[PDB]
Amino acid sequence: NAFRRKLTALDYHNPAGFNCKDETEFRNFIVWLEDQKIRHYKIEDRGNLRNIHSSDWPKFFEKYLRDVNCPFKIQDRQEAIDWLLGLAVRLEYGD
Ligand SMILES: [Cl-]
């Protein structure tokens, strides 16, 4: 059975820590984007975005997407990333 085999697979490998690592890397990427490319906030005001191991990090990201007028929400992560990269590129082009 597919579901029974999935429970066996989960015992072979618990993906939780790797999903957590991916979240961290994703958050670090957002932080680098804000710090070096979007630069929407004052540097003093990026502290909450920077605190990537916080369980409240998504709340801050939601405020960030609002603050830069991103048309996507956090739940649409792939679209938010692409949009923020597009914004970063347009901000970067022409010094
Ligand atoms: Cl998030």
Residue numbers in the entry: 0 to 94
List sentences quoted exactly from the publication behind this structure.
The human RtcB ligase ortholog RTCB, also referred to as HSPC117 or FAAP, is part of an essential heteropentameric tRNA ligase complex (tRNA-LC), along with the DEAD-box helicase DDX1, as well as FAM98B, CGI-99 (also known as RTRAF or hCLE), and ASHWIN (ASW). The tRNA ligase complex is an essential factor for both tRNA biogenesis and XBP1 mRNA splicing during the unfolded protein response in human cells. By contrast, the RtcB ligases are GTP-dependent enzymes that catalyze the direct joining of RNA strands with terminal 2′,3′>P and 5′-OH. RTCB is the only subunit of tRNA-LC that is essential and sufficient for RNA ligation, but it requires the protein cofactor Archease for multiple-turnover catalysis.
Structural modeling using Phyre2 and PCOILS servers predicted that both CGI-99 and FAM98B comprised N-terminal calponin homology (CH)-like domains followed by putative C-terminal coiled-coil regions. To verify this experimentally, we determined the crystal structure of the N-terminal domain of CGI-99 comprising residues Phe2-Asp101CGI-99 at a resolution of 2.0 Å. The protein construct adopts a globular fold connected via a flexible linker to an N-terminal α-helix comprising residues Phe2–Asn18CGI-99, which is stabilized in different conformations in the two molecules present in the asymmetric unit by crystal packing interactions. Our structural analysis reveals that the CH-like domain of CGI-99 exhibits closest structural homology to the microtubule binding NDC80-like family of CH domains, as proposed by an earlier study. The N-terminal domain of CGI-99 (Phe2-Asp101CGI-99) was able to co-precipitate a minimal FAM98B construct spanning residues Arg2-Lys184FAM98B, indicating that the CGI-99:FAM98B interaction is dependent on both the N-terminal CH domain and a predicted beta-hairpin motif (residues Glu145-Lys184FAM98B) in FAM98B, and the N-terminal CH domain in CGI-99. Taken together, these results indicate that the formation of the CGI-99:FAM98B heterodimer is mediated by the respective N-terminal regions of the subunits and suggest that the N-terminal CH-like domains of CGI-99 and FAM98B may comprise an independently functioning module within tRNA-LC. In addition, the CGI-99 and FAM98B subunits of tRNA-LC form a stable heterodimer through an independent interaction interface involving their N-terminal domains. This heterodimer further serves as an interaction platform for the recruitment of ASW, the fifth tRNA-LC subunit. There is, however, no evidence to date to indicate that CGI-99 and FAM98B, or indeed tRNA-LC, interact with MTs or other cytoskeletal proteins.
